[PDB]
Amino acid sequence: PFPLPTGYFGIPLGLAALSLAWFHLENLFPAARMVSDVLGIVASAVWILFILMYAYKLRYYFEEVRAEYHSPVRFSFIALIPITTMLVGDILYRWNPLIAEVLIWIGTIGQLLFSTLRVSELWQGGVFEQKSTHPSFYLPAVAANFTSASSLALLGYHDLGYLFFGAGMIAWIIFEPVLLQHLRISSLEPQFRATMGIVLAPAFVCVSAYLSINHGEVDTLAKILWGYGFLQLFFLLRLFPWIVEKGLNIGLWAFSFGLASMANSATAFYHGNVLQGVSIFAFVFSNVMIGLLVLMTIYKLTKGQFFL
Amino acid sequence: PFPLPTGYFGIPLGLAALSLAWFHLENLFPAARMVSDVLGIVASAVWILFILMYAYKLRYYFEEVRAEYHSPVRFSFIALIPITTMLVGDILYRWNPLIAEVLIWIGTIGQLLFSTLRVSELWQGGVFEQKSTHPSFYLPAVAANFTSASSLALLGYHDLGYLFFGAGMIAWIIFEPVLLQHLRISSLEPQFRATMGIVLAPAFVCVSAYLSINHGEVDTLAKILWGYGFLQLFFLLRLFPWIVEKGLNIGLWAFSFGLASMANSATAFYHGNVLQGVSIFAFVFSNVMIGLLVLMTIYKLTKGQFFL
Amino acid sequence: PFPLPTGYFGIPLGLAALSLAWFHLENLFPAARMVSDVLGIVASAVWILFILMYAYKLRYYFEEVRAEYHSPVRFSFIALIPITTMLVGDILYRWNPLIAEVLIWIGTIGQLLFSTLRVSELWQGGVFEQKSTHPSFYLPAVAANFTSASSLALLGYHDLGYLFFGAGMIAWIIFEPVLLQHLRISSLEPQFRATMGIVLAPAFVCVSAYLSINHGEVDTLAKILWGYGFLQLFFLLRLFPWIVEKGLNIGLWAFSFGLASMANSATAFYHGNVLQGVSIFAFVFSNVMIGLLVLMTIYKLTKGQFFL
């Protein structure tokens, strides 16, 4: 069993996203920039390591890669590989814009090709099942598009950013209804319950991407997106004891992405002087939660129960 | 069986909402203000009575309250208790702003807490069933958020109003697909058919809330919301003979809310000189329908077919 | 069995829509106007012929008309009759505005009445089944509303156009979730697979209607709509070998509508200097695909495989 679960790519993801959030506090709080760099740096480091390990998985464990790619539920986790890359590229845009652009384009093309080749195959049916409607399905169809849009906007391709952001947003709106209906009816097996954190991502990631493409302007759409994001955040906070029914696990990093985005957009909402108190609370809460996740990850690594 | 069905809270609700609509005609038609007050007054009175009776239900019929709260379908009707309260507070804002603000905040906190504790609990699964997808589910997740947004906007907290309005709008867009699919597939049981009126509420209530948050400015979003609201209104008018297949009943008050909002937004569309003829038609039709509902309720009360 | 399958109305539709697209290149490429006229003319002619045939079907094959109207899946194809009419009227607006207005109003009233009488009937349940969720359901509830909105905007009733466009857009985003879930779960029978082309229509048609109601202004909404439309175009391009698994057929004209709109909106995006390269690519691709469809139709007609 390849010691590298694909979902672990959420570790370099949530950190990387969080780094970007701190990057938006460069002017207001100088130390923030330093902090961001640290996150960025470590995130990049971790990402690179995972990529290497994943490369190994492809060379000597290709049967597992094929099995997960053809699976109707696990394939979505592969979408973490391009997403993180884009985010990592975004980080590297602060030092080497050329390498950042190359990574962003590679990740965008990769995620678009993956979604076209796999998310579109599900329409053929016969492999996807009503029990395969999971939050992780957001990653290829929703999260990847938002990440591509934000990364392209950071490069300056604002129109292409609008295109990718709209694709991701409408895909989110089109998938979430059936996902929530499935959760209400059948809910989710305990071992996938951690992935419920992904349900938090679309509402916030979206606005973050939006706030990255429209030059950080706070308008009605961003406020609406925060409305729904906070609704989902309260819903998941209520369910958190149920999510960890069998105890804490690395899968909780599924939350981090959304939480990270909740920080990112918060910075914008602080810059635009729109709900400054709520923005401060969201930023502090996201940082605290991601710090607790990092501490839990360090404890798991120390105890030796991090790799499967 | 406590003589007080929770759905009866739609009576003080539909009137109260309608009152607010008339309050928007104070400048254009002085007598309108007087009419609004009457509605407001009576609505408030009715609400208070029901609250008292509901308190009785809590003190001496707590088993029924627990049963309805734990039910996957009836719990939604409890959301009428905060909603109505908020609306009543809105009315009181024309006389005592402080009491109105206190009531609005109490109702907003109550509905948010109820949605967090219960609507998010359905994601645990095992109690919600495919046959429990009813229009009444709009009340906790959709109607409550729109009412809170409108009330907060009336108080002046416009940004928090956008947050709540967006939460409600996205929740509506996310729940309506599965609800309409269930209605198409499985025929709603006759005794629940009256609740089909709630399907009319989100399309109009939404825009009303929007028109209360953006200072009554008529833009593309409001026109789109009326587009879908009129589509649903025609759809339900076609189905009305089927909705009352087994005869008229107090449950038809489920329509009133939406109809009331149909009047409210209409006033704004009349002020903005956008579709003045359609605005007049919508206002007159909603007022006539609510008047017929009031006459039917009076007839039921006189005939002793109002209370269980 | 009547010789003109209702779905064949997509032939005069797809051409007609395409004609409108070319009509937007009158100022930039004079020959374009001529080309548009040609298409318009032929489209109109074809439409008229089909109308006559359908009249015949009503006079001497009313049993088949009743069967298709009462069917939960085939009824949607009847919605092509008003839609096409409206489009034909649009074409005639370049020569005789009065006849164009009469046709547009007749088509709008007809499609609205049809959707009210039938699409709202499905809510009763017992006739619509989970296996009856097909892309063709877009035609009465979504495509008709967008076509009516665009036609009314062309006449100058921009507010009524906004109403119809919003109705269509909200119906689209409320139906597509369950449709895509059904496609993922239960697939689609091969003889209906061609109708999956309709899945391409709403993302593009929508924006086209929008770009026809807002005077061709390119804003965030249109770019988002293209984002989703291009996502769907890629998804369907990937599936095209599977869509024609049993071979090419006239049903592929289901694509043309969407493709036609993809050209139409493209012209607007070219005028607004927004993604000019992508606009040119989309226009050329739509024209090439519709030309291939026309060639295939001519080949089928010559070989005698066109009429059933």
Author numbering:
A (entry chain A), B (entry chain C), C (entry chain B): 6 to 313
Can you list sentences taken from the study reporting this PDB entry?
The ion channel architecture features a distinctive organization: the pore-forming helices are positioned at odd-numbered TMs, while the even TMs collectively form an outer shell. This outer shell contributes significantly to the overall stability and functionality of the channel, potentially playing a pivotal role in sensing environmental changes, responding to stimuli, and regulating the opening and closing dynamics of the channels.
The HiTehA purified using GDN achieved the highest resolution of 2.9 Å, followed by those purified with DDM and LMNG at resolutions of 3.1 Å, and OG at 3.2 Å, as detailed in Table 1 and Figure S1. This discrepancy may be attributed to distinct folding patterns in the intracellular loops between TM6 and TM7. Remarkably, none of the detergents tested appear to induce any significant alteration in the position of the gating Phe262 located on TM9. The identification of a linear density within the channel cavity across all detergent conditions suggests this cavity can be occupied either by detergent molecules or by other hydrophobic molecules such as co-purified lipids.
